[PDB]
Design an enzyme around this catalytic site. Structure first.
Site, PDB file in Angstrom:
ATOM      1  N   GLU A  87       0.833  -1.202   0.000  1.00 55.44           N
ATOM      2  CA  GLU A  87       0.000   0.000   0.000  1.00 55.44           C
ATOM      3  C   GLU A  87       0.867   1.250   0.000  1.00 55.44           C
ATOM      4  O   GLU A  87       1.814   1.352   0.782  1.00 55.44           O
ATOM      5  CB  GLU A  87      -0.943   0.018   1.200  1.00 55.44           C
ATOM      6  CG  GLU A  87      -2.255   0.749   0.917  1.00 55.44           C
ATOM      7  CD  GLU A  87      -3.072   1.103   2.159  1.00 55.44           C
ATOM      8  OE1 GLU A  87      -2.490   1.251   3.262  1.00 55.44           O
ATOM      9  OE2 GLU A  87      -4.301   1.275   2.014  1.00 55.44           O
ATOM     10  N   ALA A  99       2.140  -0.010  11.181  1.00 52.63           N
ATOM     11  CA  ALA A  99       1.480  -1.273  10.931  1.00 52.63           C
ATOM     12  C   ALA A  99       0.827  -1.204   9.558  1.00 52.63           C
ATOM     13  O   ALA A  99       0.655  -0.123   8.993  1.00 52.63           O
ATOM     14  CB  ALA A  99       0.466  -1.580  12.024  1.00 52.63           C
ATOM     15  N   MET A 100       0.470  -2.367   9.022  1.00 53.97           N
ATOM     16  CA  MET A 100      -0.232  -2.442   7.753  1.00 53.97           C
ATOM     17  C   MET A 100      -1.367  -3.449   7.866  1.00 53.97           C
ATOM     18  O   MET A 100      -1.238  -4.458   8.552  1.00 53.97           O
ATOM     19  CB  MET A 100       0.713  -2.846   6.615  1.00 53.97           C
ATOM     20  CG  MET A 100       0.045  -2.898   5.254  1.00 53.97           C
ATOM     21  SD  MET A 100      -0.834  -1.363   4.903  1.00 53.97           S
ATOM     22  CE  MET A 100      -2.209  -1.978   3.896  1.00 53.97           C
ATOM     23  N   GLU A 101      -2.472  -3.189   7.163  1.00 56.64           N
ATOM     24  CA  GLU A 101      -3.742  -3.869   7.412  1.00 56.64           C
ATOM     25  C   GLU A 101      -3.997  -5.052   6.474  1.00 56.64           C
ATOM     26  O   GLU A 101      -5.156  -5.417   6.239  1.00 56.64           O
ATOM     27  CB  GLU A 101      -4.895  -2.867   7.332  1.00 56.64           C
ATOM     28  CG  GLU A 101      -5.316  -2.380   5.930  1.00 56.64           C
ATOM     29  CD  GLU A 101      -4.911  -0.944   5.609  1.00 56.64           C
ATOM     30  OE1 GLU A 101      -3.858  -0.476   6.115  1.00 56.64           O
ATOM     31  OE2 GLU A 101      -5.640  -0.296   4.817  1.00 56.64           O
ATOM     32  N   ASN A 102      -2.950  -5.688   5.967  1.00 58.90           N
ATOM     33  CA  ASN A 102      -3.135  -6.784   5.025  1.00 58.90           C
ATOM     34  C   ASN A 102      -4.077  -7.846   5.590  1.00 58.90           C
ATOM     35  O   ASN A 102      -3.862  -8.380   6.682  1.00 58.90           O
ATOM     36  CB  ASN A 102      -1.780  -7.406   4.672  1.00 58.90           C
ATOM     37  CG  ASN A 102      -0.683  -6.379   4.540  1.00 58.90           C
ATOM     38  OD1 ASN A 102      -0.654  -5.610   3.584  1.00 58.90           O
ATOM     39  ND2 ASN A 102       0.242  -6.359   5.509  1.00 58.90           N
ATOM     40  N   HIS A 129      -6.767   0.097  15.336  1.00 63.12           N
ATOM     41  CA  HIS A 129      -6.810   0.662  13.993  1.00 63.12           C
ATOM     42  C   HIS A 129      -6.701  -0.433  12.941  1.00 63.12           C
ATOM     43  O   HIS A 129      -7.514  -0.503  12.010  1.00 63.12           O
ATOM     44  CB  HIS A 129      -5.695   1.687  13.828  1.00 63.12           C
ATOM     45  CG  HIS A 129      -5.702   2.374  12.499  1.00 63.12           C
ATOM     46  ND1 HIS A 129      -6.182   3.653  12.324  1.00 63.12           N
ATOM     47  CD2 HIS A 129      -5.296   1.956  11.276  1.00 63.12           C
ATOM     48  CE1 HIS A 129      -6.060   3.997  11.052  1.00 63.12           C
ATOM     49  NE2 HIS A 129      -5.527   2.985  10.397  1.00 63.12           N
ATOM     50  N   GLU A 130      -5.706  -1.317  13.081  1.00 63.87           N
ATOM     51  CA  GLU A 130      -5.500  -2.353  12.069  1.00 63.87           C
ATOM     52  C   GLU A 130      -6.660  -3.355  12.013  1.00 63.87           C
ATOM     53  O   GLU A 130      -7.062  -3.770  10.919  1.00 63.87           O
ATOM     54  CB  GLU A 130      -4.164  -3.058  12.300  1.00 63.87           C
ATOM     55  CG  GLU A 130      -2.977  -2.118  12.215  1.00 63.87           C
ATOM     56  CD  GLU A 130      -2.982  -1.319  10.925  1.00 63.87           C
ATOM     57  OE1 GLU A 130      -3.373  -1.879   9.873  1.00 63.87           O
ATOM     58  OE2 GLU A 130      -2.618  -0.123  10.953  1.00 63.87           O
ATOM     59  N   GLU A 167      -9.248   5.249   5.877  1.00 69.19           N
ATOM     60  CA  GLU A 167      -8.467   5.700   7.027  1.00 69.19           C
ATOM     61  C   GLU A 167      -9.280   6.499   8.033  1.00 69.19           C
ATOM     62  O   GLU A 167      -9.035   6.385   9.243  1.00 69.19           O
ATOM     63  CB  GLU A 167      -7.260   6.507   6.555  1.00 69.19           C
ATOM     64  CG  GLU A 167      -6.313   5.682   5.653  1.00 69.19           C
ATOM     65  CD  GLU A 167      -5.804   4.421   6.327  1.00 69.19           C
ATOM     66  OE1 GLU A 167      -5.904   4.282   7.582  1.00 69.19           O
ATOM     67  OE2 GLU A 167      -5.277   3.560   5.591  1.00 69.19           O
TER      68      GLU A 167
HETATM   69  O1  LIG Z   1       3.142   5.706  11.281  1.00 67.62           O
HETATM   70  S1  LIG Z   1       1.932   6.079  12.037  1.00 67.62           S
HETATM   71  O2  LIG Z   1       2.526   6.803  13.168  1.00 67.62           O
HETATM   72  N1  LIG Z   1       1.063   4.681  12.557  1.00 67.62           N
HETATM   73  C1  LIG Z   1      -0.360   4.784  12.855  1.00 67.62           C
HETATM   74  C2  LIG Z   1      -1.318   4.023  12.191  1.00 67.62           C
HETATM   75  C3  LIG Z   1      -2.666   4.168  12.489  1.00 67.62           C
HETATM   76  C4  LIG Z   1      -3.057   5.079  13.457  1.00 67.62           C
HETATM   77  C5  LIG Z   1      -2.097   5.834  14.111  1.00 67.62           C
HETATM   78  C6  LIG Z   1      -2.479   6.835  15.177  1.00 67.62           C
HETATM   79  N2  LIG Z   1      -3.414   6.665  16.107  1.00 67.62           N
HETATM   80  N3  LIG Z   1      -3.439   7.780  16.864  1.00 67.62           N
HETATM   81  N4  LIG Z   1      -2.516   8.625  16.402  1.00 67.62           N
HETATM   82  N5  LIG Z   1      -1.908   8.033  15.346  1.00 67.62           N
HETATM   83  C7  LIG Z   1      -0.759   5.690  13.816  1.00 67.62           C
HETATM   84  C8  LIG Z   1       0.885   7.167  11.001  1.00 67.62           C
HETATM   85  C9  LIG Z   1       0.845   7.045   9.574  1.00 67.62           C
HETATM   86  C10 LIG Z   1      -0.097   8.066   8.963  1.00 67.62           C
HETATM   87 BR1  LIG Z   1      -0.431   8.233   7.061  1.00 67.62          BR
HETATM   88  C11 LIG Z   1      -0.671   8.853  10.008  1.00 67.62           C
HETATM   89 CL1  LIG Z   1      -1.822  10.181   9.770  1.00 67.62          CL
HETATM   90  S2  LIG Z   1      -0.116   8.370  11.450  1.00 67.62           S
HETATM   91 ZN   LIG Z   2      -5.019   2.806   8.462  1.00 66.10          ZN
END
Ligand SMILES: O=S(=O)(Nc1cccc(-c2nnn[nH]2)c1)c1cc(Br)c(Cl)s1
Ligand SMILES: [Zn+2]
Ligand SMILES: *[C@@H]1O[C@H](CO)[C@@H](O[C@@H]2O[C@H](CO)[C@@H](O[C@@H]3O[C@H](CO[C@H]4O[C@H](CO[C@H]5O[C@H](CO)[C@@H](O)[C@H](O)[C@@H]5O)[C@@H](O)[C@H](O[C@H]5O[C@H](CO)[C@@H](O)[C@H](O)[C@@H]5O)[C@@H]4O)[C@@H](O)[C@H](O)[C@@H]3O)[C@H](O)[C@H]2NC(C)=O)[C@H](O)[C@H]1NC(C)=O
Ligand SMILES: *[C@@H]1O[C@H](CO)[C@@H](O[C@@H]2O[C@H](CO)[C@@H](O[C@@H]3O[C@H](CO[C@H]4O[C@H](CO)[C@@H](O)[C@H](O)[C@@H]4O)[C@@H](O)[C@H](O[C@H]4O[C@H](CO)[C@@H](O)[C@H](O)[C@@H]4O)[C@@H]3O)[C@H](O)[C@H]2NC(C)=O)[C@H](O)[C@H]1NC(C)=O
Ligand SMILES: *[C@@H]1O[C@H](CO)[C@@H](O[C@@H]2O[C@H](CO)[C@@H](O[C@@H]3O[C@H](CO[C@H]4O[C@H](CO[C@H]5O[C@H](CO)[C@@H](O)[C@H](O)[C@@H]5O)[C@@H](O)[C@H](O)[C@@H]4O)[C@@H](O)[C@H](O)[C@@H]3O)[C@H](O)[C@H]2NC(C)=O)[C@H](O)[C@H]1NC(C)=O
Ligand SMILES: *[C@@H]1O[C@H](CO)[C@@H](O[C@@H]2O[C@H](CO)[C@@H](O[C@@H]3O[C@H](CO)[C@@H](O)[C@H](O)[C@@H]3O)[C@H](O)[C@H]2NC(C)=O)[C@H](O)[C@H]1NC(C)=O
Ligand SMILES: *[C@@H]1O[C@H](CO)[C@@H](O[C@@H]2O[C@H](CO)[C@@H](O)[C@H](O)[C@H]2NC(C)=O)[C@H](O)[C@H]1NC(C)=O
Ligand SMILES: *[C@@H]1O[C@H](CO)[C@@H](O[C@@H]2O[C@H](CO)[C@@H](O)[C@H](O)[C@H]2NC(C)=O)[C@H](O)[C@H]1NC(C)=O
Ligand SMILES: *[C@@H]1O[C@H](CO)[C@@H](O[C@@H]2O[C@H](CO)[C@@H](O)[C@H](O)[C@H]2NC(C)=O)[C@H](O)[C@H]1NC(C)=O
Ligand SMILES: *[C@@H]1O[C@H](CO)[C@@H](O[C@@H]2O[C@H](CO)[C@@H](O)[C@H](O)[C@H]2NC(C)=O)[C@H](O)[C@H]1NC(C)=O
Ligand SMILES: *[C@@H]1O[C@H](CO)[C@@H](O[C@@H]2O[C@H](CO)[C@@H](O)[C@H](O)[C@H]2NC(C)=O)[C@H](O)[C@H]1NC(C)=O
Ligand SMILES: *[C@@H]1O[C@H](CO)[C@@H](O[C@@H]2O[C@H](CO)[C@@H](O)[C@H](O)[C@H]2NC(C)=O)[C@H](O)[C@H]1NC(C)=O
Ligand SMILES: *[C@@H]1O[C@H](CO)[C@@H](O)[C@H](O)[C@H]1NC(C)=O
Ligand SMILES: *[C@@H]1O[C@H](CO)[C@@H](O)[C@H](O)[C@H]1NC(C)=O
Ligand SMILES: *[C@@H]1O[C@H](CO)[C@@H](O)[C@H](O)[C@H]1NC(C)=O
Length: 857
Positions: free
Chosen positions: A135, A269-272, A304-305, A327
């Site tokens: 992704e 993380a990634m949501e595969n 989230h994932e 997202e």
């Molecule tokens: O690499 S991440 O830091 N990882 C990540 C993934 C999902 C949710 C969150 C989160 N939850 N609460 N605050 N952040 C953080 C990031 C990538 C992007 Br595109 C962003 Cl917008 S955040």
């Molecule tokens: Zn996401």
């Protein structure tokens, strides 16, 4: 591309993939792999060509399979990442064909695509690991495919591995045949209908901890040495999975669900689908070595994932212009699930801070509508920004507080059922809400300006006797109306509070207050995505109340008033002195959310002044804020006692006192660090104060070297990150440079920690210029490791530029980016960076001489 049969970025619609069978034979020691994909496709229009996606593939053979195999000719267009199969006989409409491409390729040295890396065991052995990150657009670098999300298909995946390595993929494993020369071939079951960006496979030595959850095997994978740290993750995934299957009323459909802690991963993380993949620091956990910030981080990411398994995998946007439907929903569900089943963590503090920062960006003219056309690769990567995540969840949160929680769920469940295993756009969601309100509200009309127009409304509020005059306008400094669901709370003369709701869909209106009222506060808990500006008497009312008793407002409401007042000072709607007038109430505050926001406004002004050479003024400002919070800072204990929010308040106050050497905190911290060092790192250090203790220790060359020795030694990654933050806060420019160079090359520090290092270096005076120079001088290598436009790059551009406050620096940053490709110059983060500098220039023009006055003495 002139002799290529296709002229556009988006693939034709005439042929669609049905099933892929992908066979990969990767070699982790040579970092190459051999591949053979076989695609079943159906032709919907008579065509002589198939236009497909492929980059970095040395294609040995292409065949139209049947009985009789026909060889086909292949053309390449690398600028668009496309290849063209020329058919020997025309593909007819209503017919389907089977295509087969044998090819070889390198494994990536970037974090993108099918990439490979090397790590060192605890037994000091070198180990090899391969993983995918597709992704948004890297699947095509792994195998030829129709690499757009709307082209959903099913995948059978086959891997030839060495027997010591485990191979995981999305679907469970079906067969394993042992071959010659120490090789096994793993076959995986065919998948559900999914987009090509979700396909995933991993190869590495890993152990696992598994639990059956109602017929679905839930497993946590990690390298053998870290397996003792997966228990919390397993417990949390079970809890959230049964909460999501209940609230969504759709079972998770695959027979297993794997979560993998990857030793070298750029995203959090990634949501595969079926193969969730994480940084070690975002999945592994130990109560002995991990702070409550760490706990909350592991649980947020999991939430989230997991939510992406419905919002993104089961139901996918048609094209990346609507990425926020994936997202934004996932981020809402992450914070919603946390408030229902992990209230104790007070995750609302994290969501509120993130919305405050998204709003500052969304207020710039370089902002874009959350739904924006994108066609170029960098435009697509840039869609992964704070607006997609936190303006999208704010839109949902505005609807959920407006409609019922019960109406909202009804719409969610209806939406997900209707569109399972298919694709959606913005109007599909607004439809599902229209159906649940039986077409009384026109949600599509109300959600129009929020979806198609950048920014947010400024609601201006004035009291006139027993009524409120309300207006709205665009929030900007040098446009349609918004449908704004307003909320207000107000306290009457008998000291009684009442709250109500009203919808402002026109420019102006009048709220009838049933009584005469002491004060009024609009946008309860900032559940709406707008800033509120009060008339002068009405600011003063709220300010007078906060000094008399701030606890008639909630702690979210108080954080909102601090954020809004300072952001309205930047706009120029109120003088800076009124912002400082308001936070004078802080002597009676002891909640995290407001103190956190005040410290951020305070620290942002400090870091700006320090770079301009106003070291005196900066320090006066922190000593005035220290006096306001003095009682709170001195009550703090050096332990892990208390609720999560009290432990987070403790770290903020001790970090603020130590960083600006206020009080004797410096001394306590040095003594604790020096006793830690004597113990040789074996004495208990409370998790809440370990950042602060380390930072003080890293200020001497003995303690710096000692910390570094344990960074390369210890097993807790969360502890390692506190060490790295302390290491990167040294004032020794030689060491800071050495830290960035090292992470960039992968030696000692991994390239995944570079953005963190660069930003930490660039925040303080010693490394400020150093960090921006490292970025400029290493730009081309940075874009080899992280795709142009991605969040890592956005984060680096912003973090190295945003404390510049001079015309000279503005022209420097602009001219450097103009020397790059237009694709680079017109990146939104680059333009946002130039506007932020310009606002710093003006903020200093307006407020410097008066700031020198209120701090005079
Ligand atoms: O690499 S991440 O830091 N990882 C990540 C993934 C999902 C949710 C969150 C989160 N939850 N609460 N605050 N952040 C953080 C990031 C990538 C992007 Br595109 C962003 Cl917008 S955040
Ligand atoms: Zn996401
Ligand atoms: C990618 O390309 C590679 C290059 O061609 C290709 O070849 C593989 O390359 C890797 C990396 O070099 C090798 O992995 C390494 O293997 C060695 C040696 O393993 C053998 O020996 C050990 C023990 O004997 C050793 O003992 C002493 C010290 O203890 C040594 O000094 C001495 O010289 C001996 O080497 C033995 O345990 C191994 O047995 C394994 O495999 C058999 C079946 O094959 C099993 O019965 C057994 O249970 C065990 O799993 C083996 O005989 C080792 O020292 C390293 O630590 C590392 O493991 C591969 O061996 C090598 N493979 C081949 C067939 O040559 C890759 O295969 C290719 N990848 C793919 C997917 O195609
Ligand atoms: C954030 O800050 C707020 C505001 O300061 C805190 O809330 C305050 O908490 C303190 C606790 O120390 C409260 O003070 C307590 O008063 C209790 C009774 O008050 C009545 O009686 C007094 C005279 O005694 C009158 O003035 C008043 O009108 C009331 O009618 C006492 O019971 C408490 O003492 C207890 O503890 C001691 C030692 O443990 C025992 O020996 C006693 O027997 C007794 O059980 C205490 O003195 C204060 O009233 C609160 N104010 C407000 C506005 O809420 C939050 O607690 C704080 N939050 C955090 C997380 O720190
Ligand atoms: C402190 O002093 C206040 C004085 O206002 C007291 O609260 C009021 O109490 C009186 C007496 O009980 C209430 O009078 C009654 O109101 C009934 C209506 O209740 C519902 O409507 C109220 C307002 O509706 C109008 O206004 C809103 C806002 O513009 C519109 O959305 C509506 O469509 C209406 O036009 C709401 O406040 C209320 O919660 C209900 O929703 C009415 O049916 C009765 O016949 C009687 O007239 C008065 O409503 C209260 N006001 C408020 C704002 O709550 C309070 O009790 C005093 N403190 C103590 C301890 O008693
Ligand atoms: C072209 O290839 C497609 C893809 O395989 C063929 O269409 C497929 O047709 C079969 C039936 O002939 C479908 O299977 C059916 O599944 C349902 C429910 O899952 C079941 O009730 C039926 O009894 C039947 O088994 C299949 O779903 C369908 N498509 C896919 C993607 O699987 C098509 O027949 C091929 N030929 C032509 C000329 O198009
Ligand atoms: C690691 O995962 C394997 C499954 O891949 C577990 O061993 C399996 O246990 C499950 C039930 O937990 C059974 O359904 C399988 O039949 C088992 N497979 C084999 C080959 O024995 C194993 O328990 C997991 N490890 C831990 C520590 O839980
Ligand atoms: C545990 O798994 C069973 C089987 O997958 C679930 O029962 C299914 O529920 C869905 C939703 O109503 C139905 O569409 C399926 O037909 C059911 N399957 C069977 C075999 O009855 C069950 O709901 C799961 N447990 C929980 C708590 O959801
Ligand atoms: C704000 O940015 C917008 C676009 O991001 C700028 O608008 C463009 O102005 C040029 C003027 O030559 C036009 O050619 C474009 O068509 C405009 N874009 C759109 C989308 O209409 C605008 O210049 C900026 N405004 C300020 C005040 O900085
Ligand atoms: C399922 O989703 C479809 C879209 O595939 C919805 O159809 C839309 O319905 C609205 C309101 O009736 C129309 O204005 C749109 O034009 C329709 N779109 C299409 C593509 O037809 C349908 O409403 C949903 N079905 C259910 C039962 O909720
Ligand atoms: C605004 O609210 C006030 C208070 O509810 C309304 O004044 C009341 O009006 C009702 C209806 O005419 C009368 O029966 C009462 O005598 C009034 N109460 C008081 C305490 O004065 C007023 O009508 C509302 N105005 C609007 C435009 O809704
Ligand atoms: C303090 O901890 C360090 C680990 O950072 C220890 O260093 C290790 O010591 C053992 C032998 O004592 C060696 O086998 C390791 O190779 C050392 N690791 C290194 C040098 O990175 C150190 O020994 C500890 N202090 C004491 C007194 O034992
Ligand atoms: C492409 O693959 C063929 C067949 O394996 C090989 O002979 C050739 O060297 C490869 N070319 C490149 C550029 O990798
Ligand atoms: C693999 O890497 C080498 C070295 O950069 C390069 O020459 C070769 O073309 C690469 N393979 C492919 C298929 O691009
Ligand atoms: C610092 O001063 C406070 C009083 O403000 C006192 O309670 C504390 O013990 C002192 N700390 C040290 C390390 O001396």
């Amino acid at each position: 591309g002139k002799l290529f049969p296709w002229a556009q970025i988006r693939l034709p619609t005439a042929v669609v993939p049905l099933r892929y069978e992908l066979s990969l034979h990767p070699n982790l020691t040579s970092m190459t792999f051999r591949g053979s994909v076989t695609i079943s496709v159906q032709a919907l229009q008579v065509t002589w060509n198939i236009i497909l996606h492929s980059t970095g593939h040395n294609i040995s053979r292409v065949t139209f399979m049947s009985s009789q195999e026909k060889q086909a000719e292949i053309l390449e267009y690398a600028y668009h990442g496309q290849i063209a199969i020329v058919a020997p006989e025309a593909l007819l409409a209503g017919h389907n064909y089977t295509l087969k491409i044998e090819y070889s390729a390198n494994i990536s040295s970037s974090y993108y695509g099918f990439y490979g890396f090397s790590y060192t065991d605890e037994s000091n052995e070198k180990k090899y690991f391969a993983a995918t990150q597709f992704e948004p657009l890297a699947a095509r670098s792994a195998f030829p495919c129709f690499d757009e999300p709307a082209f959903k298909a099913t995948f059978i995946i086959k891997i030839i591995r060495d027997e010591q390595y485990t191979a995981l993929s999305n679907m469970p494993k079906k067969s394993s045949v042992v071959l010659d020369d120490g090789l096994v071939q793993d076959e995986f079951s065919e998948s559900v209908k999914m987009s090509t960006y979700l396909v995933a496979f991993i190869v590495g030595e890993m152990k696992n901890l598994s639990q059956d959850v109602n017929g679905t095997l839930v497993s946590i994978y990690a390298v053998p040495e870290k397996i003792g740290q997966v228990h919390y993750a397993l417990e949390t995934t079970v809890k959230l999975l049964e909460f999501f299957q209940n609230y969504f009323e759709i079972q998770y459909p695959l027979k297993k669900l794997d979560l993998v802690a990857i030793p070298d991963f750029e995203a959090g993380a990634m949501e595969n689908w079926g193969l969730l993949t994480f940084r070690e620091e975002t999945l592994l956990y130990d109560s002995n070595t991990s702070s409550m910030a760490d706990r909350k981080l592991v649980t947020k990411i999991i939430a989230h994932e997991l939510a992406h398994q419905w919002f993104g995998n089961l139901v996918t946007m048609k094209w990346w212009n609507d990425l926020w439907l994936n997202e934004g929903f996932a981020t809402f569900m992450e914070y919603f699930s946390l408030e229902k089943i992990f209230k104790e963590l007070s995750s609302y503090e994290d969501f509120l801070d993130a919305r405050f920062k998204t709003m500052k960006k969304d207020s710039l003219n370089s902002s874009h509508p959350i739904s924006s056309s994108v066609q170029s690769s960098e435009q697509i990567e840039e869609m992964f920004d704070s607006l997609s995540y936190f303006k999208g969840s704010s839109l949902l949160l505005m609807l959920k507080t407006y409609l019922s929680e019960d109406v909202f769920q009804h719409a969610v469940v209806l939406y997900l059922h209707n569109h399972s295993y298919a694709s959606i756009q913005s109007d599909d969601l607004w439809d599902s809400f229209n159906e649940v309100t039986n077409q009384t509200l026109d949600v599509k009309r109300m959600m129009k300006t929020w979806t198609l127009q950048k920014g947010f409304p400024l609601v201006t509020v004035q009291k006139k006797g027993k009524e409120l005059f309300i207006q709205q306008e665009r929030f900007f400094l040098n446009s349609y109306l918004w449908h704004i669901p307003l909320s207000y709370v107000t306290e009457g003369r008998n000291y009684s509070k009442y709250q109500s709701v009203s919808l402002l869909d026109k420019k102006s209106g009048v709220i009838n207050l049933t009584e005469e009222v002491l004060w009024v506060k609009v946008n309860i808990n900032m559940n709406g995505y707008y800033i509120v500006h009060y008339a002068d008497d009405d600011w003063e009312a709220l300010i007078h109340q906060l000094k008399i008793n701030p606890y008639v407002l909630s702690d979210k409401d108080r954080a909102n008033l601090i954020n809004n007042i300072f952001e309205l000072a930047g706009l120029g709607k109120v003088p800076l002195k009124r912002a400082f007038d308001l936070i004078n109430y802080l002597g009676n505050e002891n909640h995290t959310a407001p103190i956190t926001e005040a410290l951020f406004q305070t620290d942002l002004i400090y870091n700006l002044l320090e770079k301009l050479g106003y070291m005196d003024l900066a320090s006066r400002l922190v000593t005035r804020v220290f006096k306001l919070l003095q009682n709170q800072i001195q009550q703090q204990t050096w332990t892990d006692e208390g609720t999560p929010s009290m432990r987070e308040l403790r770290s903020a106050l001790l970090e603020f006192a130590c960083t600006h050497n206020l009080g004797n905190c410096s001394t306590t911290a040095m003594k604790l660090f020096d006793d830690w060092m004597a113990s040789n790192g074996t004495q208990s250090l409370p998790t809440d104060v370990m950042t602060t203790v380390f930072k003080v220790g890293a200020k001497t060359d003995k303690g710096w070297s000692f910390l570094l020795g344990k960074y390369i030694s210890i097993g807790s990654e969360a502890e390692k990150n506190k060490i790295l933050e302390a290491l990167a806060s040294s004032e020794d420019v030689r060491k800071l440079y050495w830290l960035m160079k090292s992470s960039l090359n992968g030696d000692n520090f991994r390239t995944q920690k570079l953005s963190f290092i660069i930003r930490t270096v660039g925040r303080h005076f010693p490394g400020h210029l150093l960090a921006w120079d490292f970025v400029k001088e290493n730009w081309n290598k940075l874009v080899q490791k992280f795709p142009l436009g991605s969040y890592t790059i956005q984060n680096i551009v912003a973090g190295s530029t945003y404390l510049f406050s001079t015309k000279t620096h503005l022209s420097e940053v602009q001219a450097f980016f103009e020397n790059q490709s237009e694709a680079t110059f017109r990146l939104r983060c680059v333009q946002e960076a130039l506007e932020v500098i310009q606002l710093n220039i003006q903020w200093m023009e307006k407020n410097l001489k008066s700031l020198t006055w209120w701090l005079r003495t």
